[PDB]
Write an enzyme that holds these catalytic residues in place. Sequence first.
Site, PDB file in Angstrom:
ATOM      1  N   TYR A   7       9.109  21.779  23.681  1.00 60.20           N
ATOM      2  CA  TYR A   7       8.833  20.581  24.466  1.00 60.20           C
ATOM      3  C   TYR A   7       8.804  20.897  25.953  1.00 60.20           C
ATOM      4  O   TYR A   7       8.153  20.198  26.725  1.00 60.20           O
ATOM      5  CB  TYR A   7       9.870  19.484  24.186  1.00 60.20           C
ATOM      6  CG  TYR A   7      10.033  19.129  22.728  1.00 60.20           C
ATOM      7  CD1 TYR A   7       8.980  19.274  21.827  1.00 60.20           C
ATOM      8  CD2 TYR A   7      11.241  18.648  22.247  1.00 60.20           C
ATOM      9  CE1 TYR A   7       9.134  18.948  20.485  1.00 60.20           C
ATOM     10  CE2 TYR A   7      11.403  18.324  20.913  1.00 60.20           C
ATOM     11  CZ  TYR A   7      10.345  18.480  20.036  1.00 60.20           C
ATOM     12  OH  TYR A   7      10.499  18.140  18.711  1.00 60.20           O
ATOM     13  N   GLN A  27      -3.599   1.047  15.810  1.00 58.69           N
ATOM     14  CA  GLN A  27      -4.501   2.130  15.491  1.00 58.69           C
ATOM     15  C   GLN A  27      -4.761   3.018  16.721  1.00 58.69           C
ATOM     16  O   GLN A  27      -5.065   4.207  16.595  1.00 58.69           O
ATOM     17  CB  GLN A  27      -5.783   1.557  14.884  1.00 58.69           C
ATOM     18  CG  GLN A  27      -5.559   0.956  13.485  1.00 58.69           C
ATOM     19  CD  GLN A  27      -5.273   2.022  12.432  1.00 58.69           C
ATOM     20  OE1 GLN A  27      -5.983   3.031  12.350  1.00 58.69           O
ATOM     21  NE2 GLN A  27      -4.223   1.810  11.625  1.00 58.69           N
ATOM     22  N   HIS A  58       8.065   3.890  28.498  1.00 57.44           N
ATOM     23  CA  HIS A  58       7.309   3.637  27.283  1.00 57.44           C
ATOM     24  C   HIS A  58       7.973   2.569  26.408  1.00 57.44           C
ATOM     25  O   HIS A  58       7.305   1.970  25.574  1.00 57.44           O
ATOM     26  CB  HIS A  58       7.090   4.938  26.486  1.00 57.44           C
ATOM     27  CG  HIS A  58       8.344   5.492  25.890  1.00 57.44           C
ATOM     28  ND1 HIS A  58       9.123   6.432  26.531  1.00 57.44           N
ATOM     29  CD2 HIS A  58       8.963   5.230  24.716  1.00 57.44           C
ATOM     30  CE1 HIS A  58      10.164   6.728  25.774  1.00 57.44           C
ATOM     31  NE2 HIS A  58      10.094   6.010  24.672  1.00 57.44           N
ATOM     32  N   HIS A  79       4.674  11.819  26.771  1.00 58.11           N
ATOM     33  CA  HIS A  79       5.672  11.945  27.830  1.00 58.11           C
ATOM     34  C   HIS A  79       5.141  12.486  29.165  1.00 58.11           C
ATOM     35  O   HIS A  79       5.799  12.368  30.195  1.00 58.11           O
ATOM     36  CB  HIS A  79       6.900  12.722  27.333  1.00 58.11           C
ATOM     37  CG  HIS A  79       7.841  11.890  26.508  1.00 58.11           C
ATOM     38  ND1 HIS A  79       8.713  10.980  27.066  1.00 58.11           N
ATOM     39  CD2 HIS A  79       8.036  11.823  25.169  1.00 58.11           C
ATOM     40  CE1 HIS A  79       9.410  10.392  26.108  1.00 58.11           C
ATOM     41  NE2 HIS A  79       9.019  10.889  24.946  1.00 58.11           N
ATOM     42  N   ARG A  91      18.138  19.558  18.911  1.00 55.24           N
ATOM     43  CA  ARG A  91      17.335  18.884  19.916  1.00 55.24           C
ATOM     44  C   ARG A  91      17.136  19.843  21.085  1.00 55.24           C
ATOM     45  O   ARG A  91      15.993  20.148  21.467  1.00 55.24           O
ATOM     46  CB  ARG A  91      18.006  17.593  20.366  1.00 55.24           C
ATOM     47  CG  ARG A  91      17.220  16.793  21.402  1.00 55.24           C
ATOM     48  CD  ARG A  91      17.801  15.389  21.530  1.00 55.24           C
ATOM     49  NE  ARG A  91      17.225  14.612  22.622  1.00 55.24           N
ATOM     50  CZ  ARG A  91      17.598  14.721  23.896  1.00 55.24           C
ATOM     51  NH1 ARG A  91      18.544  15.586  24.259  1.00 55.24           N
ATOM     52  NH2 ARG A  91      17.019  13.966  24.813  1.00 55.24           N
ATOM     53  N   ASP A 117       7.627  17.377  13.992  1.00 53.06           N
ATOM     54  CA  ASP A 117       7.314  18.348  15.026  1.00 53.06           C
ATOM     55  C   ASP A 117       7.538  19.736  14.459  1.00 53.06           C
ATOM     56  O   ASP A 117       6.690  20.600  14.634  1.00 53.06           O
ATOM     57  CB  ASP A 117       8.158  18.166  16.294  1.00 53.06           C
ATOM     58  CG  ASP A 117       7.835  16.897  17.049  1.00 53.06           C
ATOM     59  OD1 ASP A 117       6.796  16.254  16.768  1.00 53.06           O
ATOM     60  OD2 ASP A 117       8.630  16.546  17.952  1.00 53.06           O
ATOM     61  N   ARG A 124      -8.908  28.708  30.546  1.00 54.43           N
ATOM     62  CA  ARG A 124      -7.563  29.275  30.571  1.00 54.43           C
ATOM     63  C   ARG A 124      -7.241  29.967  31.899  1.00 54.43           C
ATOM     64  O   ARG A 124      -6.611  31.024  31.929  1.00 54.43           O
ATOM     65  CB  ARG A 124      -7.350  30.242  29.402  1.00 54.43           C
ATOM     66  CG  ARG A 124      -5.914  30.300  28.914  1.00 54.43           C
ATOM     67  CD  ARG A 124      -5.603  29.105  28.040  1.00 54.43           C
ATOM     68  NE  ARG A 124      -4.224  29.137  27.561  1.00 54.43           N
ATOM     69  CZ  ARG A 124      -3.695  28.220  26.763  1.00 54.43           C
ATOM     70  NH1 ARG A 124      -4.431  27.194  26.348  1.00 54.43           N
ATOM     71  NH2 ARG A 124      -2.436  28.334  26.374  1.00 54.43           N
ATOM     72  N   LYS A 126       0.848  -1.189   0.000  1.00 56.61           N
ATOM     73  CA  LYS A 126       0.000   0.000   0.000  1.00 56.61           C
ATOM     74  C   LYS A 126       0.882   1.238   0.000  1.00 56.61           C
ATOM     75  O   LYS A 126       1.981   1.217   0.517  1.00 56.61           O
ATOM     76  CB  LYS A 126      -0.978   0.020   1.180  1.00 56.61           C
ATOM     77  CG  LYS A 126      -2.059  -1.033   1.078  1.00 56.61           C
ATOM     78  CD  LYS A 126      -3.150  -0.799   2.091  1.00 56.61           C
ATOM     79  CE  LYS A 126      -4.133  -1.958   2.116  1.00 56.61           C
ATOM     80  NZ  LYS A 126      -4.875  -2.133   0.827  1.00 56.61           N
ATOM     81  N   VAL A 127       0.426   2.305  -0.628  1.00 57.31           N
ATOM     82  CA  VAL A 127       1.187   3.541  -0.606  1.00 57.31           C
ATOM     83  C   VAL A 127       0.428   4.540   0.268  1.00 57.31           C
ATOM     84  O   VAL A 127      -0.790   4.701   0.132  1.00 57.31           O
ATOM     85  CB  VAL A 127       1.410   4.070  -2.031  1.00 57.31           C
ATOM     86  CG1 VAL A 127       1.866   5.497  -2.012  1.00 57.31           C
ATOM     87  CG2 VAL A 127       2.428   3.199  -2.752  1.00 57.31           C
TER      88      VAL A 127
END
Lengths: 481, 481, 481, 480
Positions: free
Chosen positions: A256, A30, A121, A103, A248, A201, A333, A4-5
């Site tokens: 992050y 999924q 994880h 995370h 990073r 990201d 908020r 499959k593409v």
Amino acid sequence: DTMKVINDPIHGHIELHPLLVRIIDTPQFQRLRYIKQLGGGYYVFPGASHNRFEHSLGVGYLAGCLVHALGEKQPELQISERDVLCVQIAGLCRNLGHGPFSHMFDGRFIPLARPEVKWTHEQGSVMMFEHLINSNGIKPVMEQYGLIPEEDICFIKEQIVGPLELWPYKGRPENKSFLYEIVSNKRNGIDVDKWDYFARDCHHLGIQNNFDYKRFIKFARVCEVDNELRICARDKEVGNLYDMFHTRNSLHRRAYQHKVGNIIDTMITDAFLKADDYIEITGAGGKKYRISTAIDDMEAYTKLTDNIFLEILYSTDPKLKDAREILKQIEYRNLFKYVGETQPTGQIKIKREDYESLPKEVASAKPKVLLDVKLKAEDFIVDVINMDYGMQEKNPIDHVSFYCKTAPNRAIRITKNQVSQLLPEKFAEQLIRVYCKKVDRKSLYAARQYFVQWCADRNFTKPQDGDVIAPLITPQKKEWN
Amino acid sequence: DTMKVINDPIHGHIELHPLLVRIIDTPQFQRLRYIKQLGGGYYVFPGASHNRFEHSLGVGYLAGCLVHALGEKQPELQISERDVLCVQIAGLCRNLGHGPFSHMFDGRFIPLARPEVKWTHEQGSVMMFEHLINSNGIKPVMEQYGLIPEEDICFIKEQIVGPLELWPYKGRPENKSFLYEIVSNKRNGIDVDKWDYFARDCHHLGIQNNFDYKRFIKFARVCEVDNELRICARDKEVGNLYDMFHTRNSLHRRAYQHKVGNIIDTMITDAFLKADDYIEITGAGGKKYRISTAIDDMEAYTKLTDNIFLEILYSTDPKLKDAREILKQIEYRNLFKYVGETQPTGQIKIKREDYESLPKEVASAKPKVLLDVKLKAEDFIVDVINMDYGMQEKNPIDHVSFYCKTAPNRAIRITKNQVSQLLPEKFAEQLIRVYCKKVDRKSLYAARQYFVQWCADRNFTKPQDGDVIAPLITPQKKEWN
Amino acid sequence: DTMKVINDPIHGHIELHPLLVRIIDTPQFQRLRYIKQLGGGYYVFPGASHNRFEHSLGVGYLAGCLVHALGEKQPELQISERDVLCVQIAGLCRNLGHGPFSHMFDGRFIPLARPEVKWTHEQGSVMMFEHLINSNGIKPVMEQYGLIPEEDICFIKEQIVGPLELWPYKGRPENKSFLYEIVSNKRNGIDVDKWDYFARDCHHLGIQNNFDYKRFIKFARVCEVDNELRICARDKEVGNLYDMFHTRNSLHRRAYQHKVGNIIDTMITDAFLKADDYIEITGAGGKKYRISTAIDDMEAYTKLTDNIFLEILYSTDPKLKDAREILKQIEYRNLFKYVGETQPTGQIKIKREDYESLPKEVASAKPKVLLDVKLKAEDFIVDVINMDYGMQEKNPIDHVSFYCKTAPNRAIRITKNQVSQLLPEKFAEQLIRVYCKKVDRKSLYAARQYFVQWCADRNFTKPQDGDVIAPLITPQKKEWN
Amino acid sequence: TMKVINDPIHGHIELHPLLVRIIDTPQFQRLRYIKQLGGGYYVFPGASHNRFEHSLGVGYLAGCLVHALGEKQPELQISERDVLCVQIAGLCRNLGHGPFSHMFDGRFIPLARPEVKWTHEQGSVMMFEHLINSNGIKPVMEQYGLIPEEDICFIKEQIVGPLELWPYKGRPENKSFLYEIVSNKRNGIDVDKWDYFARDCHHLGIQNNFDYKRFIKFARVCEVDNELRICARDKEVGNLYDMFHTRNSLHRRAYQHKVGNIIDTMITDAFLKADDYIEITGAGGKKYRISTAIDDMEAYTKLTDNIFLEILYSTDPKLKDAREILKQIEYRNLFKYVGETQPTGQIKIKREDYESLPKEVASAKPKVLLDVKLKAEDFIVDVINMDYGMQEKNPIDHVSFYCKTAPNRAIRITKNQVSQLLPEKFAEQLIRVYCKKVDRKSLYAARQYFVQWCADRNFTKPQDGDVIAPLITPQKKEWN
Ligand SMILES: O=c1ccn([C@H]2C[C@H](O)[C@@H](COP(=O)(O)OP(=O)(O)OP(=O)(O)O)O2)c(=O)[nH]1
Ligand SMILES: O=c1ccn([C@H]2C[C@H](O)[C@@H](COP(=O)(O)OP(=O)(O)OP(=O)(O)O)O2)c(=O)[nH]1
Ligand SMILES: O=c1ccn([C@H]2C[C@H](O)[C@@H](COP(=O)(O)OP(=O)(O)OP(=O)(O)O)O2)c(=O)[nH]1
Ligand SMILES: O=c1ccn([C@H]2C[C@H](O)[C@@H](COP(=O)(O)OP(=O)(O)OP(=O)(O)O)O2)c(=O)[nH]1
Ligand SMILES: [Mg+2]
Ligand SMILES: [Mg+2]
Ligand SMILES: [Mg+2]
Ligand SMILES: [Mg+2]
Ligand SMILES: [Mg+2]
Ligand SMILES: [Mg+2]
Ligand SMILES: [Mg+2]
């Protein structure tokens, strides 16, 4: 059953081998569609709506590309199609173990809810992968495509979590050691997972990175080191490898570990803790679990995703009121107020056991200022973020092997002063953020006084806006002018 | 308090006046974070995880940009900061009425579940906006920044839905008519909602946007047209305008009406229909509502998002089994099978009331092929799609006013013949897609025979793969040979 | 005379005021279409075909954007349309003085062909601008648009080169000091010129830009500092500011100081040296000038572009045999061979006055190994690159003013320890590249032995490929191995 | 060894040493001094790219497509030799371009050498032959497993077609699909287009909407009429239509920009006025003119955009006129665009009528009071043929498709099978009229002449018609 593409905005048209397709089309895989890559970051960067699913597809793709490129350039390695598929599957499945909001769950919630257990994880990925294989009849499909279930499943798990217990891997011999450097690189942290999340990201966050993984793949070779075949980079690329880690760090500085994103992960963690006793998740046989215990049963963990956020938000039961209200504070908020950031000085660092004694310290400071209110420890949050190059205090470039154009089979080392003097002196540091749960004017003024005073008392770095939020306080510290 | 900056991957740093921030920080608006823009498209295009929230932000931004640019270039128009703010709010709020999976909800589910009601997401947007206003104390905040709630709320609603019932609008006078052309253009459909979705959907799908809205904004001006002030475009841009609609059509062809995306929206709709008697959503006064009745109570509708997909999927109740099973078909990728696409010929046009009888026509066809399977009407799905330039059979460019360089205030009309002979000769057509609920090989073969025979009988267009999937049928049709 | 719009791939649709239009459509400005931004870099990075012309447009545009943003945020600063136009003109015209292949000309050619004079592209820019103004009748157009040529021309030149010589400026007084920070920032180097080349060079090179100038522009204010009204950045941005310089450094490392790009700039330069007696450029009045002398007549300099490279290349004159041949060696890619890179250690700083001594020292080194061929001083090239943050040894961020959200009009300072321990300890360094004009194998081996031995004697850093190119020499140095 | 080149469009591309050897010649490096869009750079400042980088791109994509075909279908027997030949062909198909690219073969040559049939194609073949002979490429080719007699012929055929029933010699019918890659004479779908879509879009600041990677992924070889040809997957047909639509868009917005074209025209005029006086040195030291440089490859090697700057900088009074036109370009004193119209009905204007056109415009009799009388040397009439690459034909009728259910069986797909919203016609003409005199009164006059003319010939109404000539338009009943 054919290829499959899939069209991905990051990598374009990605071809998926039918076995990979079989693995992907399961509840276990999924599930990743319902877990935000950046967790609460979406509440600061509205572009960051991506989920662990598409990221995992990306990782499998890149693993495939690197292994194929190596095999293509160096036939003497005898990389098989089986190896390729196994590296692909490892790349696809190393994110299987992430929980709600990524995370946040293994970084904040689990360590608080169950302090005794040591969950990651990665282990969650191995367990979840075993449950996927076993629950969906994958083994005979594997053998149907020329894979050997016994060895190869072990190989996949090893790529994901390292040795399951001298050559420590049983999935492959030393003469294919390099395969273990692709998906999750325990040696120097340079692997295709980083590459995919850099690009993806950045694409969703609306901020950009200058790391070129395609270039890196072009110059990658396999060379012999310490009686092992390892991946080596071309010498001239050392400057780029340094920049990789810089990128990073930059991504952690901007997104992050954004102060507000972190406070949102903290408030969500808080709501999850107030709800833990009441949310029932049905596991195997029919046994019911809690958010904190779902990690014990993969059937229950399969149903543990970002959804429970809304489950808590939409609930009407009094037992969930306290959970519910916190989430509503997020909707309105009305967040905890950020008070400020500082760092320790010298080679003085804050270890894990002191993290819970910190709000008390902040509350115990005596700002010689007249305040309208008094704050207590419970009114403060102190968040300690470790920023490093991925190996504590070490330089990871000390753990990379290079080769030169004149002898492409010879591994060599490059030290830091063989590269540049403008590089960082250290490779680890700590950030300290302080927030106040009382959000009124007075309490936040007071909080700023307590905070800056606490910084002065412990000889931490002067807050950037110190002279503005506590003019009466900063002069007492002569080292701050 | 003060303005905020949001970083959006499409538009960059978007500035938000504090009133906008007050409107956005409500349950009614934050609700849009949990409604995917492209609905089931995400299940075909993994990059399309974006929700209506970020789209809404982008729309408010662009509405602001356009009204501002008009104001700066033509001070004689007397556009005030009040006008700008009301247009930004309309832009922000025209998506408030969307339901779970967006167009699946108002396009497929509501028409089946409540065929007696004439519901639209626009109406929903007006009611939801009224509820946001009233539940969140917004009117005094509006007064505080110079707005006049009666008039201005009227104006916003009118921009969203048109006149709430010669000048039919009561929110602004004819001399401000052009302001109604910005958020939701009822005249020709050229508005900022489209521009944002072109750029954002393209960014996430991995398909590239052809249309330059910044260019359009630079060449936009206001002119008098039939005693009315309207936005007119520079003459030279007429080609670009045509291309705009071409782009819209392309996006529909590649993504929004993707055969598998559509069948996925359809399966989710089926599940919702089967879950409707059991899911209860608490409304105002603790009154209970269903998925199908949530639209009658904004407090309940607020809680109606994509989450129900998961509520259904994770359920344990036996009475939800069926619905649940359908969703599980989705997770295992056991989807209804695409059989084919055809179109009507000549001047035949399928009516909306004829839709229901269509799978019966297909099942009653008599292909001369030997079959070990007989299929019934209920085994076929027939999905009828109207593709147009947004005004049924009209050319929308006939409803665009232009201006020339030499006379920047004289509005003119430009006909299609003045542009190109390479442009469409019609602006509306219908695509008929047929699917089979039986997914086995025999059933799919038989379904193919029935489908092609039915196309022959109705003198529809020959399916593209007709000679391959029905080699014994296609010869009979001399118009195909 | 009205506004023109130009479409640029970096910034999109740039609006140009009629006066800028009149300045742009002159021989002096159009000349920049024929000067490549990155000189010889195009011979390494084939996407870098861009010229100084489009960059100039970009700089003018961004100068306009920044001054405009500052003016809309703070009306009290009394920025006028005059100011906007003058800042734009300065931005447009600060590249007017570049010569053939940009930095090759003022950075290599002029310093070698004319050791006695001190000349730079900035002075070139002021002279060229004056020439443009006077040759094209610009003053009456300026007056037509409300400018005052006497003080405004001065203001523009001042922005370009600084004080033509207490407040040292004539064009604008101290309360407009910030206006001198936009185009060319002599205090810390943060200006719009950098921003444009970051974005543009990255677009053309195929390297990605990670500095977000729009964000910066959005967060910029004007505050009082030491009796001056300077531009200040939000405290929060400090990290990004550091990253901005890091980026500059990276771009120098990857592209602008590329070993082969630099050697190509060298070969072109010495070709120009060979040709310097024999090429004639017709100047003012009809006088003849050399390539090295066109610098003295602006009318002659107007015709000095990259075109000259082709003149030499296409020439048939015997007087140009030498020059020509060199250019031909570039066409066949027979370039001087790169042999290595090293750095000084400790406090050693290679001065300009010593550059000439460098090839002689390398040839003087006695490697202690078997050599088939001897090399002499002429066979070596030594290139010295000064890498810094644009202020020699100084930290540019120490010279940046910030503000906090709590009191936006209150300028403050931020120190390096207040940001990160992972920053550079040093802000300047030197790279030494060595090449050999003799390209055969034996010559190369020789050159490597000589070079490494020279690094050993000078106590320089050990080359990265040192153990491979000269294994017999490396173990003599204890600090190395 | 191999070399890696970083291209902004394709990323890091690998060049085989043979390709490197071909590239490191003056014949190839020449392309660094010829702009892809010529005069387009004076309207779109991002458009500074040259033919050199485009050629690299085309070589790379040719390699990609042939390699993908080879990997998906081993039975086709594609060798590394085939791969190299197709790469060389892609790399070299732009070698024959002259100064400002399409200005030279499209405007200059037809006006300077109206007796010659010349294409950039022919020039590419000749320049390739010259490159090969002047740099000893044949033994390098043999060194890398090539057979120069067969393979050079193959490459040339790929660039220009048969040299004059299987009409080819370099490869047999079972390798027919190889001829569809670099320059597809059958339906115009080839890698050259794909590269320029992406590159020109990158530099122009317009976004490309065609996804060639997707195409490559879906392409297969199938048997069609006793050939093995490239076939696209059925459901890609829409995208294929879009590709040509995209081409048209690019021509509408950029390549045929009114001012871009008038700049190309002014440059051409300058070259014409310079041609008797500029001297280019070719083989044996013999001299050539700009218009004759194409007769000697050594002199064509030195014929680039530099000519422009050689004319602008000249001091020779013989070159005054020429030099003065370029100077007017520098001061932005350009011929003034007066308008655009189109023929109606089946009327189609042929090349031989072109020169008669300024005359007809000057001969029109606008019934308005004027001040100046304009002549047939003050007018410029530019005729643009816009099509889908095959004149009046639909190139999609010349594409072979395959279906998922039977991937080796080729099929045809008709327009009616796809959409009623597609074009009814596939070719048309645009007529632009400019005026050489740029004062207000001459301009008003020119406008009146132009509209009157459009009416007389039953052409379409100009878009600003009612505005630039309010006294002429309400006459023509058909515009009302
Ligand atoms: O013009 C398009 C159409 C689809 N896609 C994407 C969607 C998806 O991620 C991938 C594959 O979808 P496709 O439609 O090609 O496959 P399919 O629906 O499964 O059709 P088939 O099974 O007949 O091959 O390509 C595009 O990028 N562009
Ligand atoms: O280096 C960064 C930091 C943030 N953002 C984004 C995140 C967010 O969408 C917007 C604004 O975040 P910011 O951090 O500037 O605002 P804040 O957290 O509310 O800080 P403060 O209230 O002190 O201004 O910009 C960036 O793009 N780049
Ligand atoms: O569809 C287009 C058309 C033009 N341009 C660019 C070319 C140029 O850089 C700028 C302006 O050209 P334009 O055609 O709009 O102006 P003009 O040729 O001077 O026409 P006019 O004088 O009638 O405004 O926009 C585009 O990017 N897209
Ligand atoms: O950090 C870099 C360095 C170079 N390049 C580009 C420039 C060039 O187009 C191509 C190759 O340059 P490179 O420096 O890698 O090759 P080289 O100069 O020939 O070095 P060597 O011959 O030692 O391999 O990659 C980059 O994109 N990034
Ligand atoms: Mg499919
Ligand atoms: Mg990792
Ligand atoms: Mg904030
Ligand atoms: Mg609409
Ligand atoms: Mg114009
Ligand atoms: Mg090299
Ligand atoms: Mg072609």
